[PDB]
């Protein structure tokens, strides 16, 4: 949670006019102690913050002379170029065959990441995927891959602990070339970088498969040893890329920076939940912005994921509002669809303009509130949903009693639907550019918060 | 020359809280003080979405006239009245009964 420390830091800087180099210094020190609190590659903390120090001395901006915009912009863009220079769109280069391996320390997230890639590339590539587990060591690891593969709808190549990993992956590659697959995901056992028999074993594995891609998997909570791990794995194995996992934790995962300092290999993907859908393309703009608290890249990516899962359902709510007008039917459809894409952190990060006025500790529980709405509007007869104005006291007693909640809550939800009804009408009558530009941010006077 | 100050432990002479003791949060200009656990009122708050303020009945602490609170002597366990003397060159407060400094 750098944003607590980095917020006091870079926000402190963004206050003071024509800042002395001393609070510049102190702020750098707090970024250092902040990344030190994040257990990111402590020597690489020192290096990074020395770089930020040298960069932050002589900048001038006519737009706004504020040095805090300079520290925020510098820390951002510098973490950006050090983390691979805005590589989101690029990802991995696809050839008609592709063979990718997942390697790294015990428990970093390799098996999970393999299935995430499977799902993601299954969606984007429109092609066929085969996966295989080279892990004969961890109990039930193969079964884990089989389960994940069955869940993501990806062909699974069987293997058991009684075999040799080389023979297994050789068989897998053979079957794959025979059955005309393209993307191949090979999940390997977790291993210490200082374990020679294992590292040799998978040097042999790589030698047998001849992969186009070797991906090192990093827990974002990985410590100072990262630079030592990445190098080791890059010296024997050598890796062509990096995946950074568990970024949904408060760990800042700048260890990958060390990993990208030694290796020089791009970081392709951000693991952002425990679910298969949780593979994101990595992007330094997104991780650095995510740290800083306000983001333009993650705003366009969460509005484009919301718009992708909600396209046919907002066109279903727009067709029913074209025929019967806006009802609790079109609203309820909006509710279930809205509950399926639901998350709060990907929503507040999309809007920096509203988060500048309100506390960043603001959270509505979407899983709670949304499903509550679905439930309450599941307690209405179809006439009350298509004709909401007839909902009365006894009706709200009935609705409140049906879902096992309070009448006040139902009042609140019908209030919400009232506001969204109005908004639907205002959107209907006015031109899109006028209705979007005429929205007012009200202060009861320019004096703030009152 | 101000007798009752921040963080003094006081005892309440008058009102529904008569006899109760507590700690001073702050003072106001009008000669009113606000004391810990003292003079709770039940206030109704219209829920405010900007401050993420829920609604409901908030028990709050309402200002009490400073004439009504006495500085609590911990030695004697009694309410006291206060006075001023000069010790060192500095102006200091003391209890009238045992004439000991604070």
């Amino acid at each position: 949670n750098l944003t607590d420390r980095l917020s006091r830091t870079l926000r402190n800087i963004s206050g003071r006019g024509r800042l002395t180099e001393d609070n510049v210094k102190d702020t750098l020190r707090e970024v250092r102690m902040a990344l030190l609190e994040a257990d990111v590659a402590l020597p690489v903390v020192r290096e990074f913050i020395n770089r930020v120090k040298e960069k932050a001395v002589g900048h001038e901006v006519n737009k706004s002379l504020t040095p805090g915009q300079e520290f925020v912009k510098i820390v951002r863009n510098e973490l950006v170029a050090a983390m691979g220079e805005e590589n989101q769109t690029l990802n991995l280069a696809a050839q008609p065959p592709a063979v990718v391996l997942m390697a790294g320390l015990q428990g970093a997230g390799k098996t999970t990441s393999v299935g995430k890639l499977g799902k993601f590339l299954r969606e984007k590539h429109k092609k066929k995927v085969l996966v295989v587990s080279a892990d004969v060591y961890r109990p039930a690891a193969i079964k884990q891959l089989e389960t994940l593969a069955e869940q993501v709808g990806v062909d699974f190549f069987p293997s058991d602990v009684g075999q040799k990993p080389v023979d297994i992956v050789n068989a897998a590659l053979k079957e794959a070339k025979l059955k005309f697959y393209d993307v191949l995901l090979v999940d390997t056992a977790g291993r210490l970088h200082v374990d020679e028999a294992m590292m040799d074993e998978i040097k042999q594995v790589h030698a047998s498969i001849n992969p186009v891609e070797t991906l090192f998997v990093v827990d974002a909570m990985t410590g100072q040893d990262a630079a030592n791990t990445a190098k080791a794995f890059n010296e024997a194995l050598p890796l062509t890329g990096v995946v950074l996992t568990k970024v949904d934790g408060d760990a800042r995962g700048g260890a990958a920076l060390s990993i990208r300092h030694i290796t020089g290999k791009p970081i392709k993907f951000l693991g952002v939940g425990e679910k298969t859908e949780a593979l994101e393309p990595f992007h330094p703009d997104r991780i650095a912005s995510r740290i800083l608290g306000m983001x333009x890249x993650x705003x366009x990516x969460x509005x484009x994921x919301x718009x992708x899962x909600x396209x046919x359902x907002x066109x279903x709510x727009x067709x029913x509002x074209x025929x019967x007008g806006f009802d609790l039917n079109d609203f309820l459809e909006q509710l279930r669809q809205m509950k399926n894409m639901g998350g709060x952190x990907x929503x507040x990060x999309x809007x920096x303009x509203x988060x500048x006025x309100x506390x960043x500790x603001x959270x509505x529980x979407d899983d709670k509130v949304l499903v509550r709405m679905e439930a309450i509007i599941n307690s209405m007869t179809m006439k009350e949903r298509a004709k909401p104005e007839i909902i009365k006291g006894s009706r709200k007693r009935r609705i409140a009693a049906g879902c096992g909640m309070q009448v006040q809550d139902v009042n609140r939800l019908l209030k919400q639907f009232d506001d969204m009804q109005r908004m639907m009408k205002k959107m209907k009558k006015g031109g899109x550019x006028x209705x979007x530009x005429x929205x007012x941010x009200x202060x009861x006077x320019x004096x703030x918060x009152x | 020359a101000a007798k009752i100050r921040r963080d003094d432990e006081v005892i309440v002479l008058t009102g529904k809280d008569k006899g109760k003791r507590g700690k001073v949060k702050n003072v106001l200009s009008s000669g009113k003080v606000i004391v810990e656990g003292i003079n709770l009122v039940k206030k109704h708050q219209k829920p405010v979405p900007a401050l993420n303020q829920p609604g409901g009945i908030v028990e709050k602490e309402a200002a009490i006239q400073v004439s009504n609170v006495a500085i609590f002597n911990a030695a004697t366990g009694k309410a006291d009245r206060v006075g001023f003397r000069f010790e060192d060159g500095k102006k200091v407060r003391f209890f009238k009964s045992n004439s000991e400094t604070i």
Binding site: X307, X310, X314 | -
Partner: peptide, 18 residues
């Protein structure tokens, strides 16, 4: 598409602070 962004953006959003 547009109407998606329009609707759901200030739907989710406008629901949170208002």
């Amino acid at each position: 598409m547009k109407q998606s962004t329009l609707a759901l953006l200030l739907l989710l959003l406008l629901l949170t602070p208002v």
